[model samples]
Target: QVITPVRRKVILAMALAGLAALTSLGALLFLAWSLRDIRATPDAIPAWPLGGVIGCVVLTFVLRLQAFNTSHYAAFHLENILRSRLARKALQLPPGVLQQMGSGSVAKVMLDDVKSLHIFVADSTPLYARAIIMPLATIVILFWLDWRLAIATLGVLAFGSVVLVLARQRSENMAQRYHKAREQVSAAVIEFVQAMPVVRTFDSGSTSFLRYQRALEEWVDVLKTWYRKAGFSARFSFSILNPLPTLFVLIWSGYGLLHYGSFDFIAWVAVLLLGSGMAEAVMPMMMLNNLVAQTRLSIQRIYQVLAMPELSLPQSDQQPQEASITFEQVSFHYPQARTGAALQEVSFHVPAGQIVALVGPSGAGKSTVARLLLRYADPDKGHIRIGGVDLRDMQTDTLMKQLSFVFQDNFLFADTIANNIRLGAPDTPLEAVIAAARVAQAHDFISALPEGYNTRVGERGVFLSGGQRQRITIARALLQDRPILVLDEATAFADPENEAALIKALAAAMRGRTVIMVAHRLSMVTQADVILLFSDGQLREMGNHTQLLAQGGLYQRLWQHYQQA
Candidate 1:
């Protein structure tokens, strides 16, 4: 913290304030000297240092202002750099991995941490410098003026210091507790607010609301503990620290001159006026101490995000020879799982321009296959090839360029309909966008909206119905026009003749492309060129519809169940 330029500038400005305040106090001394010499009235007194003193006072204010601006500019500029880097890394990390990190941790770092570091830069820097420089400077001058009076004043402040020292160790500990409690409360509330809409739909918000309330209760406990301990220390310490205590004593000291006719009169005045709040100035120091300690924790968390992990994917400009996909002994095991593998030696072959369907129940390793196909993660063992080239050997971005997807959770950004489709093909012409929308059976509905394609799609595309949102996703994939298509049971949102029309149009769209699909509907699987059945992390069956039915195995049972549903 000391090494930073902004911190250094703030200290310099703070030192100037000490100089200004010290000189202002010095002016009082000269006034005493002028008064002691009764013959030297106001007009006869030397002009004194009023001119120099006023200049120092004005310069101190200017320097302080300059210091504040420097800190503000420096801290926010660093925030910009950190924010930009984190944003790019967010795009590179797998979506599933990103979500698991929790929105609260990310929000705490992006918004909270950045602003926190700024507080240390702008608010704490100047005060800390003044706290140290002013007190010590005043003490040194005080002793030089009159050691006897200095000793008396120091005795009282030193007594206050002892109380502070014993309590301050606890202050540091309380500050530590405050950090953890605040973080917990912040994350809980942040999650509640961001997820409220979805939670409200299922009447699940009460659980999160309870979690949020519990966190606040815990935070209140932390605050109460701090107050109870810090309270005792404050009352006793301030009695000695204040100038009033010494002022009454100084009144008695002045009475000594009345009797003995010999006393350090100037020194008594100095201790009464200058020493009054000198001890109180250390309060800012204590606050800075607490702030610096907390900011240290926040800085570590912020950089942890700035240098966040990225997807382990293909290197160099690698490409597949053909668009056909072949998963040969692909296996994946999640590190965080309690037991069982996610996928085990899953193997399949789908020729280019043919449709291959994945059929399975929940946690049956069906979605894992699609995720691996997209190179979201490398398989624990074996290889997946597309166009006769290994996915691991293919540049992920380049390989993905030849594929289009409609995930089961079709997330859309908050933007206009035209802009959302533009995500799939960012540089494509508007005519192509309109063409894809028309092909996906979405153009008519979009054109009928209040602003046609220009109307905004709210977050998660909530403003539209499930079927309408699905159509927008299909429009995106159509515009992308990749040869390798992967659809993971994403067509459930639409129904009626329009739904049938989409299925037909989609089949037409996939006629010249490789389509890998996952669906629960047995009726859809019956039309696929090939089907792979998954059960308990293993690929249990593989064949065309007729060939699989003849086996009367897992596929047959699942097919029977599907018909029942």
Candidate 2:
């Protein structure tokens, strides 16, 4: 269906190429016929046959050129459609799926894999038509001229094809491993470069470097093994398919036939000319088989990405009625996770205009709670509701409008500072953006930049410090002005002095909104209206800070640990 829009152009290209192949064969046939006549009687030779040969060659060139243009047009058009669909699918896929696939794998599919299809469509289609049509047509003509010579020529080609097929079969099993290894290397390279800072700081390069190093070495080994398995049969096939072998067979057989008065001289000349061309066409067909293999692999990769489960949206959108949040017996397990549930029948409620903190150690499902609230994935067996409406029932855009989040790791686009701040509400007036920035304490640093609000942030806001990026993200969330706010260690990037300032700012900005804050720093949440303590996917305790500390359980121990630190 992806190619349906360009079907007509593809068919036209194929037709033109088929016609070009026949004309090309005709051109060679006439030249050979002319040569025989010129040898027999030079003076009596006519011009029309030579003239016909010229016309055939000229027509062949024109048709072939047009075929190339048409196929390329179709190929480009189809490629555009495929890439657009891929982008839409990427957006629809759950964030967890994308994270699992990795940026390198996804980019390879969108860029390299799609380009492979384009090359196959634009470059291979016409050649494929010619390769198939020319060789078959030449053989038919050869048989009409002389069956004995045709048999000799066909024998070598048939033997060559059989060898090629067997060789390809031997290598076929390795193809999947080869492609998988290539993807592994790509993923490793991306991880290595992206985490270069950490690798440099901690491991001094050996630990992280060895991963991709092993990956590259394994890739080379796979290629070497494949080549070894295929080399002999492949080489033998090429040698057998070479023009010299076909020519040798024809010449040896034709000479005996002619000596015995069974073959015409003109037929001998025609067979010699066409035999070499046939081999040339077939050689490319054999070569094209490799391209076909690669392209098929590319298609499989694209389809795998496209086939990922997408977030399902409601047929009719439902709007939440209040800022209150509730999780009713929610449970979740990550896709392909060998560990058990990330959340186990966890139930909680946060009334409108209250602050609730999720406090626990690492891997206590704290982050998973944030992810679920944002609908990165739905809980396997529970209902998450905002304002008494199920998350699944609300349209994604509608749900997004009701909640604003400032995550621990802030991400900004590679664009002007002003644009990144105004992203949530792109049409918001500049004055509103500036006011939001001021509230988040980012205005001073932003104004001091060389270009002020117009300054471009480097990729992922690399040009900005951790605290600066965090403040900008806060400004973005503030610009949204949603009914509910979720902060996951939002102040984690700030230094001790700035952290107090940011918390003060957030407290002022968070008034009159439902807030879900996940944090490890128990000091920040001591004043929270309620605290839910998690341990190993279970809510171990729930109360205000004083109540939990008074209970003298896990929360009390965690609080003691926090205070000691």
Candidate 3:
């Protein structure tokens, strides 16, 4: 019932549109009726019929204008409603689903698909009313005038309708493929553009470069197949629906009936005038039918997003007793992962205000630990408890407030630097923001900027260096002042000097907070109160650095490699 609220306006728009068509038809009929009078009188004007024509023309103009205005207003209002709802739904969706859909697909759905519906609502509704009403009303009048002429006129259009139906049927599957190919091309274009630096380095007509070209080729192929299958029928339908065929049929039939003296001359003129109008009316209907098909597909895509399963919320909220994190026999498998579980039967405990580092090779599940802790997706097996409360029992907002997360590739809004720092706590005073920045070792550089904290960061903080953006995010995390913190390779992008400074920021930020850090650099791991060595989706070893190095296990070998490097 998404259209329920706007049903009244839509009905009114259709009514006005139908009235406008009727007025035009009435004007034509009155002129045809006055043809004999004008011919017989020769010198006298058919004043009443001429005046009726003028009045009908005026009413048509007024009614048609109102129809467009009303339909457009309703169309825009519905677009806003859908866009707002989609925005809200995105907030409730899991980040993994968003990643799976990709930025290009999401943008297409939100922008292009929604606008397609807007066009359908604003333009097609009126066209549909006129296209449908005009033909039916014309047919009824023609039948009253002469059933013989009515059948002759409609018989030609009936063949056209069949051709249009065949065209639609032939193109339906290819049309679906065409839309999908377009989406693939959109995603490929975005990927190519975003990765152009790498693409330029290694993609001279190979690999990634060919993906974009292939997407285009596939789209072209789909269109070619569609045109080949549908071109004849579509063109034939247009020819049949045109006024020429209807006029020819009416003229030939009227001549025979006139010879038999069964048709009045005036009525014969009227039939000729009005019979072609029916087929002419169908021209817009034929054009708009394609738009209607596209709109239907767009709606399906939009509803697909709306109907995706949202992250489940607790029926009753639970509050954590402390900031300690515990993973109890937890296991998880990514939806698209081919190598099996990301984490398997992993159990761990971190006391409040303790620093635990997850050290592992790439794809060994260190980042997955951070994702689970943040409830990006719940573990398929066992419970992740915050302060002895299961994660699923807590409200997402409440769980978020209990911990601050900083990742290697964090995002900064295209907004003022000060506002970015204040994101987790928007009302914090400027002094507190400065204090947090100073703690994160970002204050000095921020102060050197042209506008200091008031400077606008470009999209995703493109105006800032990688280390600068990292520090800004750290400052944001520090300002949030959550009881627990998770840092997943937070200094991955920093140079040696920036890394040292980032370590200093981490030291200041980690005090008095329970912290879990994922680190590749052994320098950051040496001071950890506990280290968990993960390999092949399982925690292989857990101990202090000294004890782990003494045991001569995986951690010891990793430490030796780190030292050599």
Candidate 4:
């Protein structure tokens, strides 16, 4: 239910939009009386009925606009509220939920689904009100003229209604499948746009025309199959409603004119004029059904998003007392991981202020370990503790405040350079931001930009180079000034040129903090206090470079492979 003020506005608008058409009916009824009366006695015929039509016509003009504008305002308000609510929910949920729901699907819920609500509340509401008011009131006017004539007009209306019902039932049944196809194409288009660069590289097209092209061609075929099926039913309905009923009206009303007297003739004329007008209003009722169906589906999608579960948090004091980390018999799996377990039972400890490097192959669970330390997910089978407190007892916000993370693919918003670095500490002074950037080696490039700290980075900060983006994120983590840092070292094969500079920055960052690194480049973490080697979701070795070499296991071979490079 709407609140008091908006409810009043909606009711007033509906009444006005609904009632406005009755004036045109009044115009038709009075015009029929005036025509016959003037034929008999032109001098006695009054101008009052014509004046009433004109007066009502002008009033309807104002009423229609009032209905449209207020309904638009109300719908606009509702759409905005839904949009903001969804955004807040997305921010609260774990990042994994978003990964599960592709960007394309999420965009549809945010943009398309919310937009569908505008049609439901704004146009459909007033449209339905008019649908009810116009036909019922018009039928009453026909009867007021003569009961016999009203029966004839009602028969024609009933015939058209059968046709309308067929059309509506067909459209309503097809609505879900039609909308589902619509969503599929929308997702395809969005994916194509998002992956344009990748598509260009991967396709090298024309040679692979059958792959991407075939998928799109098939989607178009699905669209055609749907519309072709839908279009036939519309044609079938129209054939019954328009041509047959129209011919029936002419013959029946003409017979009435020939057999019955002037009163009957006048009533038939009113029915012919105003009765045809009723059909125009009935279009809205059919349209209302279609809108209601699609709009209901969109509302369901909105609720689906709102009802999705977020990562559960602890009930007690959630602030971490210290940065020392421990993972004891820790095991985990992604909610929908293809592998049996993404992380198997493993144990490790990192003392406060110690820099431990996690070394592993691609699927070795090193990244998952870093994420666990940051409290992205809790272990499935064991306790992950910080300062001897189970990490599940900690809050996301406070844990985030205590831990700083810098990943390889650093995502930056379209904002000024200074603002990007100051993300973790929004109220930090400009000097502090620059100081952090200077340590991360992002200061020189940022300072060189035309607007310096205030330059717009554009979407995803695409204006900046990859290394520059990573450094900016590094500076962000630096500005966080946390007790612990989680760093994913630059892949040796990825950015060999920037590796040395990033290492220098990393060294500066880890000066007085406990650091856990997902070390892709073995050379960078050779001096690390401990190196934990993982393979296939299990800890294969745990030792420094010398100790690992003495163990002469997987770590020795990995070190040899690194050194040979």
Candidates' C-alpha lDDT = 0.68, 0.77, 0.78, 0.71
Q: Candidate 4 lDDT, tens digit per residue, 277-395?
A: 66556567878999988887787777777887464454457565774777788888756555467778888777798888878867347777766666665667888877777777765
Q: Candidate 3 or 4, higher TM-score?
A: 3
lDDT tens per residue, model 1, 497-565: 555766765765676778887765666688888988787678887789989889888777877877787
Q: Write the per-residue lDDT of candidate 2 for residues 1-565, one digit (tens) a residue.
A: 3454678889889888889989999999889878877877877766978988999999999999999999999899889989999888777777766765465677878899879889998888877887889988998898887777777777777778776776666555766887787788788889988878777877579977788688779878988987887779867876876678887887788767866677767778788877777777776786679788888888887777777666545433666577478888988876566457888898877778888988765844788888788777777799987667777776677666878887777666655565445556666477978887787777887787766687766665544444567677777777777878888776676487566667766765676778887876775688788899887678888778889889899887887787787
Q: What is the lDDT ranking, best to worst?
A: 3, 2, 4, 1
Query: Which digits, one per residue and each the tens of the lDDT, describe model 3 over residues 249-327?
Result: 8777866776677777788888887888877886787668988787878888888888874754543476656747888
- Which residue pairs clash in candidate 4? none
Off by over 4 Å in 2: 1-5, 36-40, 100-104, 159-231, 313-316, 494-500
- Which candidate comes out best when scored by lDDT? 3
Q: Which candidate would rank higher by TM-score, 2 or 4?
A: 2
Model 2 scores a TM of 0.87
How accurate locally is residue 561 in candidate 1, as Cα lDDT from 0 to 100?
A: 74
The pairs that clash in candidate 1 are 322-387
Error of 4 at 304 (Å): 1.5
| Per-residue lDDT value at 123 in model 1 | 77
